[PDB]
From a paper:
The Csy complex is composed of four Cas proteins including Cas5f, Cas6f, Cas7f and Cas8f in a stoichiometry of 1:1:6:1, and a 60-nt crRNA that integrates all these protein subunits. Consistent with previously reported structures, the Csy complex adopts a helically twisted ‘G’ shape with Cas5f, Cas6f, Cas7f and Cas8f protein components integrated by the crRNA. Target DNA binding and R-loop formation induce conformational changes in the Csy complex, enabling it to recruit the Cas2/3 nuclease for degradation of the invading MGEs. Here, we report the cryo-EM structures of three type I-F Acr proteins, AcrIF4, AcrIF7 and AcrIF14, bound to the type I-F CRISPR–Cas surveillance complex (the Csy complex) from Pseudomonas aeruginosa.
The 83-residue AcrIF7 from a P. aeruginosa prophage adopts a globular shape with an anti-parallel β-sheet core flanked by two helices in an β1β2α1α2β3 topology, consistent with a recently reported NMR structure of AcrIF7 (35). First, AcrIF7 binds to the DNA vise in the N-terminal domain of Cas8f and mimics the PAM duplex of target DNA. Specifically, D29 of AcrIF7 interacts with K71 and R78 of Cas8f, mirroring the phosphate group of G(–2) of the target strand within the PAM sequence of target DNA. D44 and E50 interact with K28 and R24, respectively, mimicking the phosphate groups of C(–2) and C(–1) of the non-target strand of target DNA. E38 interacts with R58, imitating another phosphate group at position –4 of the target strand. In addition, S80 of AcrIF7 hydrogen bonds with N250 of Cas8f, while Y36 and V37 of AcrIF7 hydrogen bond with N111 of Cas8f. N250 and N111 are reported to recognize the PAM duplex on the target DNA. This result suggests that AcrIF7 not only mimics the surface potential of DNA substrate but also the bases in the PAM sequence, thereby blocking the initial step for target DNA recognition by the Csy complex. Consistent with this hypothesis, EMSAs showed that AcrIF7 effectively blocks target dsDNA binding to the Csy complex. Interestingly, AcrIF7 and AcrIF14 can interact with Csy simultaneously, reminiscent to AcrIF2 and AcrIF1 which were shown to bind Csy simultaneously.
Author numbering:
A (entry chain B): 3 to 224, 239 to 322
B (entry chain A): 8 to 434
C (entry chain I): 24 to 358
D (entry chain J): 18 to 83
E (entry chain H): 24 to 252, 258 to 358
């Protein structure tokens, strides 16, 4: 929402069992809500001590390996599970299917505040890396890079540049540093205009049909595949209200009795895995929160993408 | 719209239930027909059915797919539409709600009774709008009719205080000012059933199987078809998917998740050229994706002008994706493998000098690093332009027209940005 | 009245990674950074049937016709190469810290009571009995699960990875240290104080646990096996899938954690098993039997409720079990 | 094909489980209508002997593991 | 009442490796560490019809029409080179020990009774009859399955591998030691004592079994064959890393051909130790459960109700426990 004064780069973090189930309709890379909740956890744990405000994540995903397996004779896939403990009686517990995946992402945390001036850049970069080393990103532990070739350090890029050329130089230097991955942005205006063209073709078509049409490899007869611009994916773009907002000590069995609970439901927007130098400014492509809590509509996106 | 036809329709449903019970009774003695015709025939069937409603619940967002030892709250609530454009889910269903049932499966006759389609709509939807046709048929006294109507309407209400079990999910959300909201999400099962119906119609439907066979005939069909690759199946009940919900009997588990995958979700291993034949076959090292991308550029030859505008924007996008995949191939080859400085030979295409960035500088300090920083090897783009001239054919309908000018200008600006990205490998 | 918090959840302390297994030769274990990874490859197996016939298939005709239609499987195997007799199993371990602070708790009164209880434990008897046993399951290579049963010599090397480098390096003989005796050893005590200072402070202590098992040339090593329901049709069915991280066999993270948690020798049943895993209603998956039943007053929930709510402090062994269940993590709470 | 049974005092009405009321009888038609599978005729008298032998306020949960 | 456990998982003792095969010349078998491996290569074959017709294909018109269009295939063959006549099949055998202890069991009483039963077996008579037969199946090269049937002279070298070096090296003539008679030698009894000490848990036994089979110049050798998913690829051969190999369970099945106690005639000789003791080639299941001599009724009579069988049948039962398996009902 606001512009970051600096752009921190947490380097390639190895996540071993992330959540492959991003949403009820999407499997694969975990939801960007996990990464925005991670940067809010980082702000809640060391952001208040350094007098900075870590907002926004650029999700890069150098490596992804889902713990899946294609069954024999089926085109679809199934998830490799774990073995839960037995019950108190000795029988096998009722299995619940949780998708696990191995990640390697690097995060662009947009850091703005009055703590960039108090501390050096390398100190606050090192302290948020040490705080991220004892955390988890989507349910999966962050592997801490022991006894390898060399440890990947951080770089807090002060985005306030003296010139346009030095700014473009350090943006290119950072893009070369997070290069083999694929930045994730939220392209929802493309989904809405594809819904507009779909409704032009056939009326009363809703945007779930436009989302599914942007998802699949659909064929057209003269046979030619309808082309897709980029790697468009369905992503859960936040939540939506189902119940009115309850009081803190009102709902039963909540997490805490001091925070208002509201029953919610996902909102599957459209995302687009694009390469990091297709953006020409890394102060875009960061994932912020947008709540508007009177209406529901607790959503996350990349504002200022285009 | 009159109460007499609704009355006789309800009596016909009750009598069909009793006739099915008597036909599947296999009785000859014990006089159970008297008790069955006293209970399951009269308007006391409405009485014990209205007693049975509190065992059921019409739901749209169940909890039980989240870990099935969870006794929380299940909601039949449709969200309001976001004013923000783009994103949507489960509020698009206006007249296509499938409307799951949770609760005691022994009381499913109440839901089958409220789901009869008597005039033009459900009996339940007749009971929500209090009319003359409603609340006159299901009794002769309006007091117990009002009581049974209030019972039947309660099939879509939350029973008890709102709750979410310790095994359920509930997630803090940072508000703009301060504070959080707990946000316990519920599994949208009517939306999952709708997307599951769309996916089953597009995969196993007859109108898609016909076009799929017409593709194998190589003939012409009116409509096309979809494919939906990389779907993952998630079943909710382990061995008993009956114990989750109503529609989880129809889709036996089987959530059918769409793929949200990054493009490097298939690990490609790295290979550097060793010998002269390896340097002739591995100078390019062309992945399946760039061949899939150049085959699309090969299908972008012919054009009419109003289509050639979008075709030129698509050709610019494809050359951008090819150049960017070349940049990522150079990136992962220069970073992952030390094989560019593994062995010496006679032919390794040493004019490239881009896929061996740390290989010739971090070991040789003044030998090749002084031949890469002052020379700044960026002549790889001129050799890379030969690949994209091989991607296009010899079509003279564009070579003797202004399409070659637009092609050359987009190629020049794209090799310009490829050159300035390739220029500063030294920093 | 201080009723039980309806939501309890503890974050997993002692969080290991996948145990990547790579192969090579003994007497160059000190140069083991370029050892090639043990790859998971397929092989085909024919079997004649051997399951117990259910007294209706004991006809000679049906059995003879069933040994002429054999089952044709495709199993995954992980073998050492023909010129390698040593298995380097290498994983990382974060000993996180904050072992009594729950990850989710409803009641602030229950939360403060539980934190006062765990602080009473840590002040009276800190993590020195638990961490000795975690250091033993690191020291003897119990995390080498079936790769230990006939190894010639197992040697475990543990490095306290500091900021970027090895701060303190251990080297154990994992066959001299048994699988059922938690004795006291000086280097094991130093590792126990390191895991103690990891479990007490707010920062994580990172170890690198490398174990070498001299199995033999070309022999089979045993990585973890993936739980795949719906294998598919029986034609191309792969009946056994071994876990591989990236063309490299590995034991799962929860399997290494299950071998590290095998410290519980305090259960009321006799110790024919010796130590079992720290579980609530402490249950052994291989035995198919849940010890520490709720019928006796010795499971984790009743010991925790008597310790926190009504101040009945259990025995020192049972509160070792309770705090080891807190370090293990979990999801608890009533409706 | 394995029709288990458990007497529950409070039922789990959040899922689609088959609970028989204490002062009622097993219904094979309701089990064949709710779930797709039909009850075999040897399970019915066991479920009747369990459903009749029920204290007031004790539900009979009947489920198959096919 | 001591019913049988619902899981009984026995580990595989006598754990072999994939039998790699190389190639070289005889009389330099002693310097056979650098011999080139027998690579599996492809070749096309052309088959005519030779199967039994089903009384409707006996019309000469369709017979000649199907002969006129014969089926092409692409088999995998592994032959010795044209200058080599000896096949060096080299595997390692690790003898584990702890034969009667199951890896998984429900009942503690049944597990204890099985441990007492195997322990009173071992105390009454060690693993001396079993290890003599395992040592014979190592000495006579039955693990050379079809590479033995026409070999001129087979020689098996078995080395006890200690720390990294050879503790005691054997050298047998695999054709003098027959395929069906279990005689007694001095070196075979020393190898039997070594495998006995391996199975009793009183030592670590890692043998490296090398077997040279003088087949002939350029002849065909037979590795194990994979299952198959114009160029129909009718035979896919096993290969570990560009080197033909025999499967580990094939070598284990050849080592377990010690069972000469099956109740039928002993004209066939030893068969493989299996429950319901069966040979998949001959298609006949000896020790059918009608007769009281399969593994399951013998174990359930030896452990549950203490009807101890004869010495031969309990040798067979402990040979099945050394083999390992998935025992126990549901």
């Amino acid at each position: 929402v606001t512009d970051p004064e600096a752009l921190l780069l947490l380097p390639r973090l190895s996540i071993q069992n992330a959540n492959a189930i991003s949403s009820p309709l999407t499997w694969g890379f975990p939801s960007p809500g996990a990464f925005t909740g991670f940067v809010h956890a980082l702000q809640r744990r060391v952001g208040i001590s350094l007098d900075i405000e870590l907002d926004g994540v650029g999700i890069v995903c150098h490596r992804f390996e889902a713990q899946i397996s294609q069954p024999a004779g089926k085109r679809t896939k199934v998830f490799n599970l774990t073995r839960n403990p037995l019950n108190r009686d000795g029988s096998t517990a009722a299995i619940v299917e949780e998708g696990r995946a191995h990640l390697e992402v690097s995060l662009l945390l947009g850091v703005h505040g009055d703590g960039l001036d108090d501390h050096p850049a390398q100190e606050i970069a090192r302290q948020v890396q040490e705080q991220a080393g004892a955390m988890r990103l989507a349910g999966g532990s962050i592997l801490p890079w022991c006894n390898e070739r060399f440890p990947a350090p951080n770089a807090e890029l002060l985005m306030l540049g003296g010139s346009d050329e030095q700014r473009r130089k350090n943006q290119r230097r950072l893009t070369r540093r997070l290069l083999p991955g694929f930045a994730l942005v939220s392209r929802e205006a493309l989904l809405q205009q594809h819904l507009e063209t779909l409704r032009t073709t056939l009326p009363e078509a809703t945007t779930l049909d436009a989302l599914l049409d942007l998802c699949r490899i659909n064929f057209e007869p003269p046979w030619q595949v309808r082309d897709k611009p980029g790697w468009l994916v369905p992503i859960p773009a936040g939540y939506n209200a189902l119940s009115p907002l309850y009081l803190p000590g009102e709902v039963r069995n909540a997490r805490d009795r001091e925070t208002p609970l509201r029953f919610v439901e996902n909102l599957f927007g459209l995302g687009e895995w694009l390469s990091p130098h297709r953006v020409a400014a890394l102060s875009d492509l960061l994932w912020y929160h947008h709540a508007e809590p009177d209406k529901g509509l607790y959503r996350w996106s990349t504002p200022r993408f285009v | 719209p009159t109460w007499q036809e609704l009355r006789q329709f309800i009596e016909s449903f009750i009598q069909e239930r009793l006739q099915g019970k008597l036909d599947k009774l296999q009785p000859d003695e014990d006089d159970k027909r008297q008790t069955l015709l006293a209970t399951h025939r009269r308007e006391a069937w409405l009485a014990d059915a209205a007693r049975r409603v509190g065992q059921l619940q019409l739901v749209t967002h169940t909890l039980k797919p989240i870990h099935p030892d969870a006794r929380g709250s299940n909601l039949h609530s449709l969200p309001q539409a976001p004013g923000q454009p783009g994103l949507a889910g489960s509020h698009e269903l206006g007249d296509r709600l499938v409307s799951d049932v949770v609760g005691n499966a022994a009381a499913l006759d109440v839901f089958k009774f409220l789901s009869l389609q008597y005039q033009g709509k459900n009996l339940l939807n007749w009971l929500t709008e209090d009319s003359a046709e409603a609340l006159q048929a299901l009794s002769d006294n309006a007091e117990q009719a009002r009581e049974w109507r209030q019972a039947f309407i309660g099939i879509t209400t939350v029973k008890g205080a709102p709750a979410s079990h310790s095994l359920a999910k509930q997630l803090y959300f940072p508000l703009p000012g301060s504070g959080y909201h707990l946000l316990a999400p519920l599994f949208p099962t009517s939306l999952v059933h709708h997307v599951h119906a769309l996916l089953r119609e597009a995969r196993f439907g007859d109108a898609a199987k016909a076009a799929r066979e017409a593709r194998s005939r190589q003939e012409s069909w009116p409509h096309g078809f979809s494919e939906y690759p990389n779907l993952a199946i998630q079943k909710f009940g382990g061995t008993k998917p009956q114990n989750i919900s109503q529609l989880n009997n129809e889709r036996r588990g089987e959530n059918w998740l769409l793929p949200s995958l990054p493009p490097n979700w298939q690990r490609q291993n790295v290979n550097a050229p060793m010998r002269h034949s390896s340097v002739f076959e591995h100078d390019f090292g062309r992945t399946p994706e760039v061949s899939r991308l150049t085959r699309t550029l090969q299908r972008f030859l012919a054009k009419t002008v109003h289509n050639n505008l979008a075709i030129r924007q698509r050709r610019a996008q494809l050359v951008a994706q090819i150049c960017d995949e070349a940049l990522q191939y150079a990136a992962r080859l220069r970073e992952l493998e030390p094989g560019w400085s593994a062995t010496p030979g006679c032919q390794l295409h040493d004019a490239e000098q881009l896929w061996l960035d740390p290989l010739r500088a971090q070991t040789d300090e003044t030998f090749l690093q002084r031949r890469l920083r002052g020379d700044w090897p960026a002549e790889v783009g001129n050799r890379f332009a030969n690949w994209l001239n091989r991607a296009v054919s010899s079509d003279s309908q564009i070579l003797g027209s202004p399409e070659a000018a637009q092609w050359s200008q987009e190629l020049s600006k794209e090799l310009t940005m490829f050159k300035e990205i390739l220029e500063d490998e030294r920093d | 009245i201080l009723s039980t918090a309806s939501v309890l959840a503890f974050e997993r302390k002692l969080d290991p990674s996948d145990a990547l297994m790579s192969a090579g030769a003994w007497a160059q274990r000190d140069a083991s950074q370029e050892w090639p990874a043990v790859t998971v490859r397929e092989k085909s197996v024919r079997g004649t049937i051997s399951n117990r016939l259910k007294t209706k298939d004991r006809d000679p005709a049906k059995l003879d016709a069933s040994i002429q239609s054999p089952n044709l499987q495709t199993v995954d195997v992980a073998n050492l190469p023909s010129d390698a007799d040593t298995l380097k199993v290498r994983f990382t371990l974060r000993v996180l810290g904050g072992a009594g602070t729950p990850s989710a708790c409803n009641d602030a009164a229950y939360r403060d009571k539980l934190l006062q209880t765990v602080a009473t434990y840590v002040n009276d008897q800190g993590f020195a009995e638990l961490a000795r046993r975690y250091a033993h399951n690191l020291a003897n290579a119990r995390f080498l699960w079936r790769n230990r049963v006939g190894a010639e010599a197992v040697e475990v090397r543990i490095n306290h990875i500091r900021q970027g480098e090895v701060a303190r390096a251990w080297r154990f003989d994992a066959l001299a240290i048994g699988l059922r005796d938690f004795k006291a050893d000086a280097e094991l005590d130093a590792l126990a104080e390191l895991i103690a200072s990891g479990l007490s402070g707010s920062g994580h202590v990172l170890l690198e646990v490398v174990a070498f098992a001299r199995i033999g040339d070309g022999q089979e090593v045993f990585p973890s096996q993936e739980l795949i329901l719906d294998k598919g049709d029986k034609k191309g069915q792969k009946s056994k899938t071994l876990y591989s991280v990236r063309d490299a066999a590995a034991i799962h993270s929860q399997k290494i954690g299950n071998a590290l948690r095998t410290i519980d020798t305090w259960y009321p049943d006799e110790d024919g098993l010796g130590p079992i895993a720290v579980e609530p209603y402490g249950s052994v998956t291989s035995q198919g039997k849940a010890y520490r039943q709720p019928k006796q007053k010795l499971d984790f929930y009743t010991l925790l409720d008597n310790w926190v709510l009504r101040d009945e402090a259990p025995a020192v062994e049972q509160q070792h079990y309770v705090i080891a269940n807190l370090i293990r993590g979990g999801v608890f709470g009533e409706a | 094909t394995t029709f288990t049974s458990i007497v529950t005092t409070n039922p789990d009405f959040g899922g689609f489980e088959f609970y028989v009321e204490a002062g009622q009888q097993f219904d094979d038609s309701a089990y064949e209508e709710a779930y797709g599978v039909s009850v075999p005729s040897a399970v019915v008298e066991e479920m009747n002997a369990k459903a009749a032998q029920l204290k007031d306020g004790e539900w009979l949960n009947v489920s198959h593991e096919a």
